[PDB]
Every structure is written in structure tokens, then in C-alpha cells.
Design a protein around this ligand. Structure first.
Ligand SMILES: CCC(=C(c1ccc(O)cc1)c1ccc(O)cc1)c1cccc(Nc2cccc(C)c2)c1
Ligand SMILES: CCC(=C(c1ccc(O)cc1)c1ccc(O)cc1)c1cccc(Nc2cccc(C)c2)c1
Lengths: 232, 10, 230, 10
């Protein structure tokens, strides 16, 4: 059924399934602390996870998969998906990361948490890259779906690959519609997918640091704790 | 068993 | 940069010509495998491979046009990915096995000889199987490996690099078009190949994480390569 | 400096 979707129907499907932009519990009066900001991000991520799961079900081909396979893909891709989301909404905010409408931060405030500045700069660079490319929302939702299906795909792995091929066709269809030459289409498609390599990298570094402070004990919620264990 | 499993299951 | 003035065919030929040699392991069949000796063999092999990787990088069109420090940065970021895609490529014709060297062919069962390595082992085997089912051509492999070099650290310090990356993309498409693949098959295959680079990145990260854990033998060059990821 | 520095120049 997901393979019977044309390019346009694929786009509208992904757009309609798009989760909302959630607010943080940021208190502009309360002084910042390493525990609180990470707490804010942890609290926000936990609420976004609920939307992401239901968003995942509306991604064409995902519900056709085995329950255990759905679980695996999400466990693998959840932080990548949160990051590309963050990066996307931060496009129109040069030098700043929009974690939430009420939580807009430059790198100086990222220094509040020890060592966050490294992953902060990578996210900024990614968002800057998207802005320079002038990434479209139609392209964004395709990329995010690719992450979900691709990140944990390594015995009827063929369906997933068939769906991934459909998303590729959808991306190309968008670029041809925007007036890009064949050479331009192939190059842009490549540029977009190469960024997914950096998003994977940022995810891995992120998980690493997350798993470290799980042992440091100093507010992870129960679904977020089971996500972390999937990487350890 | 997992929370994610239950949520995906509903 | 003379790398942009190149045609697709002479980009391919330049990359094929730049290819590093297949090195041999110190492997000793009269001795069995312990965790320490296994990692020792792999470390010694990687250390020697690295020297040739540097000669190969210099011959990658566009790389020499970079600042020395930018060259250093890219190599520090991508070195394990590059070794891994090499390992995966030469393991294609050995399903279920990893050809670290012609005298060092290992299955996943031998991956258990060192604590936890079977995980990254299964990942590599999967990538190899993926390449095999895709019929990854050597002309395509060399393009992918060059892409990893230029792309992996491009956002950690640029326009020139992206223009070379575009150039290599044009080369990949040119290779697929020559093979008779239709226009749809061209972009689909392109996407399939580039998505695999994300998994190679993941494998490198997991591997790197483990590597700076047992620093707690390793040559001085590796110690510096490993320290760059800290 | 770094060993990688020397190797790249040589
Ligand atoms: C990239 C920031 C991030 C978040 C995050 C990202 C996007 C969102 O939409 C929501 C949250 C995050 C923070 C905590 C979580 O439990 C989950 C997501 C993130 C992810 C991992 C690590 C870090 N920062 C960090 C850096 C160094 C050391 C430590 C302990 C943490 C931020
Ligand atoms: C995948 C093997 C690997 C290598 C390697 C890769 C390709 C080559 O052509 C040559 C060697 C490697 C081994 C040691 C090094 O110092 C550098 C590269 C590699 C990389 C990282 C980790 C592991 N194995 C490992 C070690 C400890 C714990 C776990 C879970 C895995 C192998």
C-alpha cells in the first residue's frame, strides 16, 4: 500500500504526520544550572518521544513492519530524529539552537553543561548547512523518514529498501519541480544524504554522553531510560 | 514489555 | 584547484591509481587467539595501513589543495571509517568472513576472542553482504572512500570541499549511466550507497569508543589518531 | 606537533 503512493501523495502524507513544536518548561527567572538545563532538555525529549512514536506509525511502510522491528528502528534512530528536528527549526536562527520557542540558546549558554559546546557547534554547523542549501520542508520530512527507516536496517529487509527507494524518488521529484537540472538534482540529493552521516555522528556522541551521566545518576524518565539501554 | 513496545502496540 | 577541471573518466582513473596496496598481517597460525594478541594483530595491521592511507589521501583529487591542518583534521576524523570501508570491500567475496589481510581471514566466531567485538563484527559482515548484493564495483568503491575522507570532518571546522564532493557525485552517476542503469536506477543506487556511509560512520564511532577504552599496546601514531577523538 | 603532520608533508 505504501508502494502504491505517488510522489505527491508521499509528500502530503509525511507533512500531515508532522509532530508539533513543543515548549520547554524553561523558567526565565530560575537561574541556570547544568542539572536544570539537561533536565529541561530531558523533559522536552521525553514529551517529543511520544509524538515521534505516533509520527512513526504514519510514515508509509513503517506499520507494515514487525512490531519488534519497529521497536528496533526507533531505539536506533530516536536521537537522530530529535536532532534533525532541532536543526531544522533552528535554520532561521543563525548562531542559535531553538530547542523550543521559549528555549533559544547560543553556544555560550551551551557551556553551562560541561563539554556540550562540541555537539553544540556541530548542530549549528548542520543548521547553517541547511540554511545555505535552503532546505525545504518537503525535503526535511523526507530526510527524517529516511533516518527512521535507514539507521537500524543493518529477513524481509527489501520492503524497507523498497520504501527508501520510493522516498528517493520523492526527493528527486521535488527537485525537478523546483527547476533543478539533472546534474543539480543528483548533487543536491547527495548533499542531503551526506548530512545524515553527520547526524549519525552527532547522535552517537550524544548517546555516549547520555549513557555516562545515567551512571552519574545526577532525572531520566522511564521511556528515555529504556531508549538509552538499547545502545548499551 | 518495553514501554516503546507498548506504545507502538496501542 | 585542478581537481575540478577533470573529466569523470580521469577522476576514476586518478582514484584507481591512488589505491593503497593490500598489506599482510603478522598472523601466526601456530599460535592461537587471545584477546590481547588479536587486538595486537589488528593494531599492527592498522598502523601500517595508515601510512599508505596518507599517500592515498594526497592523491585524492582536491585533497592536496587543502590546508595541511585541514588535511590533518579530515584524516583524524575519517581514518577508521576509511579502514572499515576497505575491510568491508575486500571481504565482499568472502561471505560470513572478514578479510583483514590475505593471511588473516576471520569469521564472526573468532570475533568473540575479544570481549564484545562480535557486535561490530556482525555490522561489518552486514555491510559487506549489502555491498555484495548490490554488486558494488571497484570504480564505485573508490568514489565512496574518497567521499568519506572529504565529508566526515567537513562540518568540524569548505566550499572547495563541497565542490569536489559534487564532482565525485557526478563521477558516481557517470559510472552508473555507463553500466546501463536507467535514470531512476541511477539516483536510487546513489542514495543506497550514500546511506551506507551513515552505517560506516556508526561502526567507526562504536569502534573508536572501544579503542580509547583499552588505552585504559598501540603505536604513537594511533595514540595521536585516537586522541583526536577525545 | 603531530606525527600525522610529518607524514602528510613526506
Ligand atoms: C542536542 C541536544 C540534546 C537533547 C535534545 C535534542 C533535541 C531535542 O529536540 C530535545 C533534546 C537531549 C538532551 C537530553 C536528552 O535526554 C535527550 C536529548 C542532547 C543529547 C545528548 C547530549 C546532550 N548534551 C550533553 C553533552 C555533553 C555531556 C552531557 C552529559 C550532555 C544534548
Ligand atoms: C574492524 C576491526 C578494527 C580495526 C581494523 C579495521 C580495518 C583494518 O583494515 C584493520 C584494522 C582496528 C583494530 C585496532 C586498531 O587499533 C585500529 C583498527 C577495530 C576497530 C575498533 C575496535 C575493534 N575491536 C574491538 C575492540 C574492543 C572492544 C570491541 C567491542 C571491539 C576493531
Amino acid at each position: 500500500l505504501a508502494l502504491s503512493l505517488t510522489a505527491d501523495q508521499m509528500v502530503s502524507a509525511l507533512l500531515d504526520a508532522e509532530p508539533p513544536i513543543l515548549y520547554s518548561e524553561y523558567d526565565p527567572t530560575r537561574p541556570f544550572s547544568e542539572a536544570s538545563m539537561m533536565g529541561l532538555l530531558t523533559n522536552l525529549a521525553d514529551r517529543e518521544l511520544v509524538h515521534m512514536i505516533n509520527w512513526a506509525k504514519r510514515v508509509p511502510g513503517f506499520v507494515d513492519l514487525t512490531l519488534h522491528d519497529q521497536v528496533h528502528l526507533l531505539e536506533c534512530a530516536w536521537l537522530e530524529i530529535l536532532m534533525i528536528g532541532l536543526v531544522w527549526r533552528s535554520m532561521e536562527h543563525p548562531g542559535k539552537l531553538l530547542f523550543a520557542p521559549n528555549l533559544l540558546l547560543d553556544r555560550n549558554q551551551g557551556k553551562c553543561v560541561e563539554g556540550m559546546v562540541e555537539i553544540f557547534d556541530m548542530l549549528l554547523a548542520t543548521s547553517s548547512r541547511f540554511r545555505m542549501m535552503n532546505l525545504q520542508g518537503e525535503e526535511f520530512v523526507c530526510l527524517k523518514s529516511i533516518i527512521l527507516l535507514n539507521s537500524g536496517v543493518y529477513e524481509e529487509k527489501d520492503h524497507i529498501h523498497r520504501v527508501l527507494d520510493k522516498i528517493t524518488d520523492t526527493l528527486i521529484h521535488l527537485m525537478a519541480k523546483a527547476g533543478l537540472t539533472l546534474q543539480q538534482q543528483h548533487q543536491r540529493l547527495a548533499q542531503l544524504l551526506l548530512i545524515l552521516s553527520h547526524i549519525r555522528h552527532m547522535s552517537n556522541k550524544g548517546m555516549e554522553h547520555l549513557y555516562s551521566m545515567k551512571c552519574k545518576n545526577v532525572p531520566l524518565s522511564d521511556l528515555l531510560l529504556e531508549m538509552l539501554d538499547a545502545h548499551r | 514489555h518495553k514501554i516503546l513496545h507498548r506504545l507502538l502496540q496501542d
